[PDB]
Design a protein around this ligand. Structure first.
Ligand code: CLA
Ligand code: CLA
Ligand code: CLA
Ligand code: CLA
Ligand code: CLA
Ligand code: CLA
Ligand code: CLA
Ligand code: CLA
Ligand code: LMG
Ligand code: BCR
Ligand code: SF4
Ligand code: SF4
Lengths: 131, 73, 86, 79, 663, 119, 218
């Protein structure tokens, strides 16, 4: 037997297939494997099965899909109402210009529109995982 | 037992640094010695910057692609 | 001194050896090509860096590669004539 | 002053000069003291940057080093 | 063996490339060196600020300029040069009085707006900033010692287990941590700095601009608009309110990442991993590139909005301040913009790990998969813009040279006009709904004409080509079809030899070198556009559609006062401007030989000169050349030196023209 | 008078733009002939060797330059690799994992960092 | 191969081996250089040739000897001679002390001709593209010299590249417990072989804890 180039290539393939599996394990300890680096944080897997895991939505991971859907629609309604009642209907610009003050309820509500967007995103993420 | 693509058969180049990467070229000959690392010899219509239209490739860098056709490399 | 490396794609042309102006390269026996020979660079301390070997190499991408190292230059790699560094 | 440029001459733009001194010599000396302090500290900093960190200090230097209690927390909080 | 004369250039070409240091062995040393260099640079900035404040305090007339700012001129510093005439009086002095220079920086308006009234306040400010420089250097020393003390505490450190070596990666967690840095930057350094500046305005700037008022009541936060009539600048109350709003927003935003506790805030890694990013955030070159790409819009908008909406008292009343500030900040932001691409290329060369061949997961991977499409389409848009701008300009030039101004092709700038009309309707609706209306916005919306359209197309062409060169260099820095091993070599290297067709200017650094010319040209176009529209809006609006107008009515015409500066008829206060004009022309032309003539010629020339020296009677018995052997500059060094000469000439030739034309 | 600051200039300007620059240039050309000159960018300086060895003496940075550093239990890795190669060894092949890795680690590049021989 | 006794050029004035050459300023610069290269050959007829340092020359019917500053000039003259079917030419490097080093036909056979006993120096057993990425070898032995990596290191970093793309199955490195570990280095329990068992059990505990925590909302 002499080591043909095909045999060397076979050893290359065997070595790479074994080592690529070994380095993923708890026995390689590379700086690229630290927290904040490539691997997910220990108790908080973000993506599994090609689907956003429940841990993505942070403190909302315990919320039900129905609860998140209700919160999403409610926040959408309230925030859209605030934006429409601050910009087009019931404008506050003239009132505040003459020394008045903003209708604080409108300002608080209007911030619930993007919150509602991300809330409905979280609702879909929860629904995918069956929660 | 013949090894590699047949003579005169078109092959697509899979060598990433090759000037003809993902191009096609006729197989001139395939060296039958198992000790040769790059036995497949392929000739191309398009020369590289060294004005060379032929090169020897490895057994794992040619995939036996069909004929080029009209207006296709 | 530069760094002249020979890769497995060498087909024993001997053109790189013939093109070298300072006898850096040489032909050694091998078994990875039909020519049963590959190039070698045993004396890269005399490699000026002209890259004629790369011009002469006919493989798809050069089987011989010269890596320039300017913060490494010696008197031989610079071709000093008026001045001796020894 | 001999002005140049069209606008200075056609608008009468002038450059007033204070007839007083500006800063007294004592104030300039007070600034120069702190400038010298900056200069000495900068020369020291240049020396330290040129020489860089000395890792072998633990073999000769006294003490035992110190990691501040927040630095440990920042170490184990992540990266 | 020893070195040659090229050692100096080789060393100085990477004198600050701390990654290339020889003693540096780990990211701890690199990060600590970078942190200490940051401290030293902050000290330099503080000393520069104190310098300007001192010279305004001592060798200047702030106390008199503040009284009558509109017709008066500020003083930069005195002139003490023994080369002047010891007799007569220089054109820069009032007879027997000392020699002075007019400041074109704009610090006078800055200090006046900020609330300075007396020289004594400026002197105290200079003292405080020198103190801050001392503090910065001492902080550098403190942090060097603290990190060395951690290193020494590794003499009393062991985990009693083989995992103890993991501490190697956390030694520089102080510098390399990202979540804490982002949180505290965006919160403190941005929001609370804005809030503190609002406090400064409410306590000093607004009190020291009008008659005495209430105890800084919340009526100091207004929403007027722009361009207070008397000082022709933004309302200080508006500025304070703006900084307050920005501060509140950024303070709220600064609570986003997990900085000090693991139970609050989301991690940046998890944010990126679930988006179209997940880049290698541990690269210092990548962070530098993407923050230089952040200072670029900031500096460009600074240039635009210092002029459009002048924020400083009587800044619009200075015909030289307004142009000098805009040109300066445009050049600064162009440099930062090209820096971002240069360091992106360096990131790809040095600090980017890529999958095997096909894993299309990283964003850089997906960009590199179709990089040819990107470069081809960028080339297409560049070609279109160049062809159709030069051809229409040539049409206008030819048809106006042929006594036919009415045969020009003048595309009315309809899209920019529509944007301006929408913005003007919004602003007018804002103003009409005010009991204190009749406001002004200065040059926020300017008359847009076909000349504006053509110049905007030229500017877009320049930006497209600069981005093309830089992006091609970045994408092919790791390997192109011509040289499919480019990531094995340095970021900058000479060439790949005359063979394989010839390979001059093949490195990514060479792509940067080529792109710097286009950056300079695009910046010159932008600055010429601004300065021409500033000098005569009417003549620009009418005769700027043909390039001969730019050549004659701007360059040839406006250069009259500068050349007349020093002559055989006397001198003006523009004598320095004309002398620097000629000197910068000489510098610009001197770099042509470093760019056109290449090394081998000169190496033979140096060999001949060295032959002479080793042949001259006395020299040969003292100096054989074996110690610091004279050699011609290497190829990369030559290209860089020619680029430096060209950049210096092109940049520094302009300020004399600006001063001669506007002043 | 508006002057009287030129008393400072007549000393500082000649000093910092003639005496300091000339002293700096002379000191720089003197420094150029030290064995420590530009030790961070110029290869083969004594201080570079001392700094590298000082880094290697630190217990954390002992095996820092090794590209293969990290394997917590290299014996387990080698045993697993040998087992995986045994099931894939081609016919009566006589190559073992141990000598294969040993000969794949030993290359022949005499002219690599040969500048570590003067200082 | 036997090296000749090439004397120092400053001590062999007026030698019969010197070919008749015109002599120019291109010759080696004495008074500044002490390293000289010498090329010797035996010719058959006095055929005119061109010196590498300017000016022409006529060989001798017997032995020939020339001195040059650079090895490149000697090799250029060697190629010129070999074009005239003149083999058996040897090129020597003369040290300052006079030491003679035999350089060009090092083993007696020209480098373009295969000779037994030679070994491929600076050989790399893969295509040029097989070199490891520079980014992978940062602050290692090959910090900015990825083309100098031994093939084992190239395979190791290639396997690492293969591994560090399957992110979900990676193992996050546990955060060290700085506050309660880190005693004085004299405070150790030795038992190195037991330390790996402690590694095994501690990592098993870490993995079990991570699995338990993940199986709460996933
Ligand atoms: C304006 C630009 C410029 C300038 C100044 C030069 C200057 C020079 N070129 Mg050059 N060149 C240029 C553009 C320029 N080139 C371009 C565009 C090309 C096209 C490729 C070439 C191509 C070229 C070739 C091919 C050759 C030259 C040569 C020369 C040199 C011969 C002239 C000489 O020695 O005068 C002296 C140099 C001067 C600049 C004259 C002025 C000197 C100043 C005014 C006096 C000293 C100032 C004072 C000391 C201040 C001190 C410095 C301060 C920091 C204190 C000289 C260094 C030739 C050479 O080197 O042969 C000898 C040569 O072979 N050039
Ligand atoms: C606008 C974009 C945006 C989005 C999509 C999110 C989304 C999220 N944030 Mg967040 N955050 C944002 C802006 C945003 N934030 C801003 C602007 C701030 C500064 C006030 C914060 C401050 C913040 C904190 C302090 C925390 C979150 C947390 C969270 C997660 C739980 C959601 C929750 O309970 O909120 C309702 C979720 C992934 C929590 C989390 O899961 O962290 C682990 C958490 O502790 N965020
Ligand atoms: C032979 C030519 C020559 C020389 C040697 C000088 C020398 C000097 N000039 Mg000067 N000058 C000259 C011609 C010259 N001038 C001409 C022709 C004009 C136009 C009329 C001027 C106009 C001029 C002005 C307006 C000023 C000077 C100043 C200065 C001083 C600044 C030094 C400094 O800070 O270095 C620093 C050097 C650098 C940063 C360059 C690094 C590269 C210095 C003594 C300045 C001064 O008085 O400083 C106190 C100053 O304000 N000069
Ligand atoms: C010779 C050295 C020299 C030095 C050290 C200074 C120093 C200073 N000048 Mg100044 N100046 C000088 C010469 C010098 N000047 C000359 C000759 C002119 C006439 C063109 C001016 C015109 C000038 C103006 C109009 C202004 C200053 C200002 C200032 C201050 C801020 C820095 C600055 O703008 O530099 C600018 C430097 C120049 C314009 C000329 C130097 C060009 C160098 C040699 C090339 C680049 C060097 C490189 C980047 C480092 C600072 C006190 C500003 C200020 O507010 O001060 C209170 C300001 O508004 N200077
Ligand atoms: C080389 C760096 C550099 C330099 C020398 C300057 C110089 C200047 N800047 Mg500036 N700037 C820079 C980079 C730089 N800029 C960058 C990168 C940014 C973006 C963050 C800015 C953002 C900026 C703002 C927002 C303002 C200035 C202003 C000024 C001027 C007065 C500053 C001063 O003395 O306050 C003491 C002065 C001409 C101020 C100005 O226009 O004053 C007239 C001003 O309002 N700059
Ligand atoms: C058959 C002719 C032909 C065709 C169909 C195309 C088609 C294309 N070229 Mg192109 N090109 C051609 C010839 C051609 N080229 C020639 C001869 C040159 C050398 C000057 C170029 C140089 C060129 C550049 C530099 C670029 C393109 C680009 C492009 C693409 C965008 C369209 C564009 O920019 O057009 C504009 C075309 C030009 C500016 C080149 C001039 C057009 C030539 C003169 C037409 C010649 C036609 C030929 C004489 C027909 C003879 C027919 C007869 C024998 C029967 C498009 C796929 C761009 C791209 O890749 O973006 C996607 C791009 O950046 N081309
Ligand atoms: C007057 C000077 C001048 C002109 C006209 C051009 C023209 C051009 N350059 Mg160029 N360049 C110049 C100077 C100039 N360069 C200098 C001094 C440098 C520094 C080395 C460069 C560096 C440079 C680079 C690095 C690149 C260009 C590119 C381009 C092309 C941009 C696309 C375009 O507008 O095509 C329109 C064509 C014309 C306007 C030419 C006229 C055609 C007839 C007359 C109509 C174009 C051919 C880019 C390119 O190739 O784009 C595809 C590119 O990548 N140039
Ligand atoms: C590469 C193409 C290109 C690029 C980069 C630009 C870039 C620019 N144009 Mg512009 N323009 C173009 C082509 C282009 N133009 C063409 C072909 C026309 C028609 C003659 C115009 C007409 C035009 C006007 C009237 C105005 C601008 C303006 C501007 C500037 C503001 C951005 C904007 O609103 O553009 C709009 C965006 C585009 C035009 C993109 C279209 C790109 C396509 C592919 C070009 C080809 C279209 C094709 C010829 C349509 C044929 C129709 C036919 C089938 C009937 C910016 C610098 C404004 C400006 O500078 O004001 C200060 C402005 O007012 N452009
Ligand atoms: C107005 C001023 C604006 C004009 C300045 C613009 C200059 C652009 C800045 C670009 C600098 C970064 C590029 C650079 O440093 O590398 C440009 C090159 C980089 O150097 C190259 O580096 C490579 C490794 O990356 C290789 O080692 C090459 O051999 C080496 O030449 O630097 C030099 O060649 C410098 C030579 C000239 C040195 C002059 C010393 C300056 C002293 C006066 C101060
Ligand atoms: C004793 C006394 C006196 C005297 C004083 C003096 C003598 C002074 C001087 C002073 C001076 C003479 C000063 C100077 C200064 C300078 C400076 C201050 C500079 C600085 C710089 C910096 C800071 C920077 C730095 C750097 C660099 C650039 C490099 C790198 C690094 C770094 C960054 C560091 C009197 C009698 C009066 C009074 C009493 C006391
Ligand atoms: S020229 Fe290239 S292929 Fe031919 S022998 Fe030399 S290295 Fe090998
Ligand atoms: S670069 Fe020139 S001297 Fe060096 S090995 Fe190649 S041909 Fe020979």
């Amino acid at each position: 037997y002499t080591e043909t180039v095909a045999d060397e290539r076979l050893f290359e393939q065997v070595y790479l297939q074994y080592t690529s599996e070994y380095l993923k394990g708890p026995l390689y300890w590379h700086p690229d494997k630290l927290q904040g680096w490539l691997p997910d944080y220990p108790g908080t897997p973000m993506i599994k099965e090609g689907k956003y895991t429940s841990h993505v939505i942070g403190n909302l991971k315990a919320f039900s899909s129905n609860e998140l859907a209700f919160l999403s629609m409610l926040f959408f309604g309230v925030g859209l109402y605030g934006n429409l009642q601050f910009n087009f209907y019931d404008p506050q610009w003239a009132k505040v210009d003459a020394g008045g003050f903003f209708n604080v309820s409108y300002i608080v509500e209007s911030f619930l529109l993007p919150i509602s967007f991300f809330m409905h995103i979280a609702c879909y993420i929860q629904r995918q995982n069956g929660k | 037992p013949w090894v590699g693509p047949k003579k005169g058969s078109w092959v697509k180049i899979l060598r990433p640094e090759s000037y003809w990467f993902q191009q096609r070229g006729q197989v001139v000959n395939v060296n039958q010695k198992p000790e040769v690392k790059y036995p497949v010899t392929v000739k191309f219509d398009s020369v590289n910057y060294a004005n060379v239209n032929t090169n020897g490739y490895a057994l794992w860098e040619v995939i036996e692609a069909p004929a080029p056709g009209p207006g296709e490399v | 001194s530069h760094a002249v490396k020979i890769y497995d794609t060498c087909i024993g042309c001997t053109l790189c050896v013939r093109a070298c102006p300072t006898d850096v390269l040489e032909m050694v026996p091998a078994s990875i090509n039909a020519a049963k020979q590959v190039a070698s660079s045993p004396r890269v301390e005399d490699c000026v860096g002209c890259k004629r070997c790369e011009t002469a190499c006919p493989t798809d991408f050069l089987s011989i590669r010269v890596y320039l190292q300017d913060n490494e230059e010696t008197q031989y790699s610079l071709g000093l004539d008026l001045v001796d560094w020894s | 002053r001999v002005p140049g440029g069209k606008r200075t001459q056609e608008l009468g733009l002038v450059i007033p000069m204070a007839d007083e001194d500006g800063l007294t010599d004592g104030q300039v000396a007070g600034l120069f003291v702190i400038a010298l302090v900056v200069f000495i500290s900068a020369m020291d900093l240049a020396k330290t940057m040129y020489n860089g960190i000395n890792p072998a200090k633990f073999k000769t230097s006294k003490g035992k080093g110190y990691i501040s209690p927040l630095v440990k927390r920042y170490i184990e909080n992540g990266f | 063996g020893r070195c040659a004369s090229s050692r100096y250039l080789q060393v100085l070409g990477s004198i600050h490339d701390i990654e290339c240091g020889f003693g540096i062995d780990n990211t701890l040393s690199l990060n600590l060196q970078i942190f200490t260099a940051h401290w030293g640079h902050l000290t330099i900035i503080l000393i520069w600020v104190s310098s300007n404040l001192y010279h305004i305090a001592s060798n200047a007339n702030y106390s008199l300029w503040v009284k009558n700012p509109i017709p008066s001129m500020p003083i930069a510093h005195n002139i003490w040069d023994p080369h002047f005439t010891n007799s007569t009086s220089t054109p820069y002095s009032h007879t027997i009085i000392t020699t002075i220079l007019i400041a074109y920086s704009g610090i006078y308006n800055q200090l006046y707006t900020s609330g300075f009234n007396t020289i004594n306040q400026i002197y105290k400010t200079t003292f405080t900033f020198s103190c801050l420089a001392v503090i910065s250097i001492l902080l550098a020393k403190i942090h060097i010692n603290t990190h060395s003390e951690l290193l020494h505490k590794l003499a009393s450190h062991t985990s009693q287990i083989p995992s103890f070596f993991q501490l190697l990666y956390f030694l520089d967690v102080a510098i390399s941590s990202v979540n804490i840095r982002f949180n505290f930057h965006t919160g403190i350094l941005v929001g609370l700095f804005s809030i503190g500046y609002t406090g400064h305005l409410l306590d000093i700037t607004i009190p020291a601009s009008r008659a005495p008022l209430i105890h800084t009541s919340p009526s100091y936060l207004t929403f007027f608009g722009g361009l207070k009539s008397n000082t022709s600048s933004l309302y200080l109350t508006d500025i304070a309110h703006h900084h307050l709003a920005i501060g509140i927003i950024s303070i709220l935003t600064g609570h986003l990442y997990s900085s000090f506790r693991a139970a609050l805030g989301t991690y940046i890694r998890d944010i990126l991993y679930t988006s179209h990013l997940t880049h290698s955030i541990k690269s210092l070159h990548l962070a530098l590139s993407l923050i230089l790409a952040s200072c670029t819009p900031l500096t460009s908008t600074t240039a635009q909005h210092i002029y459009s909406l002048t924020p400083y008292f009587y800044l619009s009343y200075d015909h030289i301040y307004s142009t000098a500030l805009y040109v300066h900040h445009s050049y600064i932001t162009s440099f930062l913009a090209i820096a971002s691409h240069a360091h992106t290329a360096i990131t790809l060369v040095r600090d980017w790990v890529a999958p095997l061949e096909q894993e299309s997961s990283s964003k850089q991977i997906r960009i590199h998969t179709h990089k040819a499409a990107i470069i081809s389409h960028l080339s297409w848009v560049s070609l279109w813009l160049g062809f159709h701008t030069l051809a229409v300009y040539s049409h206008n030039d030819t048809c106006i040279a042929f006594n036919s101004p009415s045969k020009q092709i003048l595309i009315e700038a309809s899209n920019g006009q529509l944007i301006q009309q929408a913005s003007g309707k919004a602003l007018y609706g804002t103003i009409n709904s005010i009991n204190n209306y009749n406001k002004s916005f200065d040059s926020f919306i300017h008359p847009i004409s076909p000349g504006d359209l053509y110049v905007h197309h030229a500017i877009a062409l320049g930006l497209h080509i600069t981005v093309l060169i830089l992006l091609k260099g970045g994408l092919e820095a790791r390997g192109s079809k011509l040289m499919p091993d480019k990531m094995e070599h340095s970021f900058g290297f000479s060439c790949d030899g005359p063979g394989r067709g010839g390979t001059c200017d093949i490195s990514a650094w060479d792509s940067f070198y080529l792109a710097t010319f286009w950056m300079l040209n695009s910046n010159a176009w932008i600055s010429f556009y601004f300065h021409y529209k500033h000098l005569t809006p009417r003549q620009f609006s009418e005769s700027s559609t043909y390039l001969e107008s730019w050549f004659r009515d701007y360059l040839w015409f406006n250069s009259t006062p500068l050349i007349h500066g020093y002559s055989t008829l006397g001198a003006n206060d523009l004598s320095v401007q004309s002398w620097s004009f000629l000197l910068t022309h000489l510098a610009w032309a001197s770099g042509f030989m470093f760019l056109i003539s290449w090394r081998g010629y000169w190496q033979e020339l140096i060999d001949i000169i060295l032959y002479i020296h080793l042949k001259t009677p006395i020299l040969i018995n003292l100096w054989n050349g074996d110690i610091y052997t004279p050699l011609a500059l290497s190829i990369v060094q030559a290209r860089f030196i020619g680029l430096v000469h060209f950049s210096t000439g092109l940049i520094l030739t302009y300020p004399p023209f600006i001063i001669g034309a506007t002043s | 008078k508006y002057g009287d600051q030129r008393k400072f200039a007549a000393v500082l300007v000649p000093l910092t733009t003639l005496v300091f620059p000339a002293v700096a240039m002379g000191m720089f050309v003197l420094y150029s002939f030290q064995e420590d000159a530009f030790w961070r960018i110029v290869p083969g300086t004594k201080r570079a060797r001392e700094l590298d060895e000082a880094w290697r003496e630190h217990p954390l940075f002992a095996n820092s330059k090794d590209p293969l550093d990290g394997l917590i239990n290299p014996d387990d890795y080698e045993k697993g690799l040998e087992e995986a190669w045994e099931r894939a060894k081609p016919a009566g092949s006589t190559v073992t994992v141990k000598d294969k890795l040993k000969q794949l680690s030993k290359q022949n590049n005499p002219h690599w960092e040969s500048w570590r021989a003067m200082s | 191969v036997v090296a000749e006794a090439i004397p120092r050029p400053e001590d062999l004035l007026d030698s019969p081996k010197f070919p008749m050459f015109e002599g120019s300023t291109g010759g080696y610069m004495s008074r500044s250089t002490r390293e000289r290269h010498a090329i010797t050959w035996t010719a058959k007829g006095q055929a005119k040739f061109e010196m590498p340092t300017g000016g022409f020359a006529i060989m001798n019917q017997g032995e020939n000897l020339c001195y040059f500053r650079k090895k490149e000039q000697c090799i250029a003259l060697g190629k010129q001679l070999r074009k005239m079917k003149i083999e058996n030419y040897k090129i020597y490097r003369l040290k300052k002390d006079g030491t003679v080093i035999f350089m060009h036909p090092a083993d007696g056979v020209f480098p373009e001709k295969v000779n037994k006993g030679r070994v491929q120096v600076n050989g790399r057993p893969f295509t040029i593209r097989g070199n490891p990425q520079q980014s992978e070898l940062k602050f290692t032995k090959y910090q900015g010299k990825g083309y100098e990596a031994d093939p084992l290191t190239t395979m190791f970093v290639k396997a690492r590249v293969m591994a560090f793309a399957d992110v979900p199955n990676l193992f996050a490195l546990p955060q060290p417990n700085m506050d309660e570990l880190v005693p004085a280095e004299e405070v150790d329990k030795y038992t190195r072989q037991e330390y790996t068992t402690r590694m095994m059990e501690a990592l098993k505990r870490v993995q079990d804890d991570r699995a338990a925590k993940a199986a709460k909302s996933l």
